[PDB]
């Protein structure tokens, strides 16, 4: 039954920079991690946006429109947990 030990954190980031959100979850079975941005499932297929190992979402060449609420969703056949943070690109 999943619990998020460390969700994403609030950040101010620079335009063109690379930032990440990380989401450290435990539970059995191991929680899968999903990202929403502003309520919509993030598209890790824009090529700026990468899902890396260890529950890291990485966003390269940050744009002003990447500002928003980012939510980590940690899911298990038992249940799910949630933790969000606000990112400001400037």
């Amino acid at each position, epitope marked *: 039954g999943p619990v998020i030990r460390q969700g994403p954190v609030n950040q101010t980031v620079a335009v063109d920079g690379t930032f990440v959100l990380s989401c450290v979850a435990t539970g059995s079975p191991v929680p899968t991690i999903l990202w929403r941005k502003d309520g919509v499932l993030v598209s890790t297929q824009d090529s700026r946006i990468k899902q890396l190992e*260890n529950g890291v979402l990485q966003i390269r060449y940050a744009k002003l429109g990447d500002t928003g609420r980012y939510t980590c969703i940690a899911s298990t056949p038992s249940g799910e947990a949630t933790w969000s943070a606000y990112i400001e690109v400037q």
Partner: antibody
Framework: EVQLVESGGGVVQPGGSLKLSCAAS????????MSWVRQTPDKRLELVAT????????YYPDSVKGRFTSSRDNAKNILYLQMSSLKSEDTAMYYC???????????????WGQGTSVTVS | LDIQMTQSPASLSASVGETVTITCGAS??????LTWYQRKQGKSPQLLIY???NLADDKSSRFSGSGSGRQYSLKISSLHPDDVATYYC?????????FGSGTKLEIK
């Protein structure tokens, strides 16, 4: 056979200006993000520019932001770095490097040129 | 505010056939987003390890990358004279993509 050849290095005066070129061949240059990395005389390394495959996006760290401009010619397969307002700390070997396509897709540089020397004073 | 990478030792000399560990510490958790480069004298760096733990294509299995959180290791098993180089780690989590200052490996 992947090849990267930097040129355009030399000795310049403080506040001066230089433009480096990197000729690429042996790969589909228009597909790859490219970086410029420099190596100072103390042997430390520093990423100074990245540019994505179509030239649409560029990144520079604070140490060079405002002074360095990266651009590419995808038809002739050349990467450029215009450097201006140069300072003695900019003295370094400059490499152009290819960003690797990987899984997971961590940023990493798989092919590097042999570099071109820049000296400021 | 930028992520510091500290490498140890700064240099070392070891003998042929020895196994040698080089360490890289980050000032915050970097989640395996680390890469290792090898630079031989008068040459440009080459990719060794990506994502902390993945060996690059045409590189010897004598090299292995390990670690997690803030602590990473590059191990060189069965030291060979061609391993003479400076080894560098790089933070590839968030910009600036800072490099450790390098570990120079010599043969006695």
């Amino acid at each position: 056979e992947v090849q990267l050849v930097e040129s355009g290095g030399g000795v310049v005066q403080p506040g001066g200006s230089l433009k480096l070129s990197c000729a690429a061949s042996g790969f589909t240059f228009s597909t790859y993000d490219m970086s410029w990395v420099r190596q100072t005389p103390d042997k430390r390394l520093e990423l100074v520019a990245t540019i994505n495959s179509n030239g649409g996006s560029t990144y520079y760290p604070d140490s060079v932001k405002g002074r360095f401009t990266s651009s590419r010619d995808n038809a002739k397969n050349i990467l450029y770095l215009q450097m201006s307002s140069l300072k003695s700390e900019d003295t370094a070997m400059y490499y152009c490097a290819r960003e690797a396509l990987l899984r997971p897709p961590y940023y990493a540089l798989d092919y590097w040129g042999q570099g071109t020397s820049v000296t400021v004073s | 505010l930028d992520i510091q990478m500290t490498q140890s030792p700064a240099s070392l000399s070891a003998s042929v056939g020895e196994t040698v560990t080089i360490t890289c510490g980050a000032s915050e958790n970097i989640y395996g987003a680390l890469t290792w480069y090898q630079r031989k004298q008068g040459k440009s760096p080459q990719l060794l390890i990506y994502g902390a733990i993945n060996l690059a294509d045409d590189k010897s299995s004598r090299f292995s990358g390990s670690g997690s959180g803030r602590q990473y290791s590059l191990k060189i098993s069965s030291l060979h004279p061609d391993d003479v180089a400076t080894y560098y780690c790089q933070n590839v989590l968030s910009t600036p993509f800072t490099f450790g200052s390098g570990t120079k490996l010599e043969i006695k």
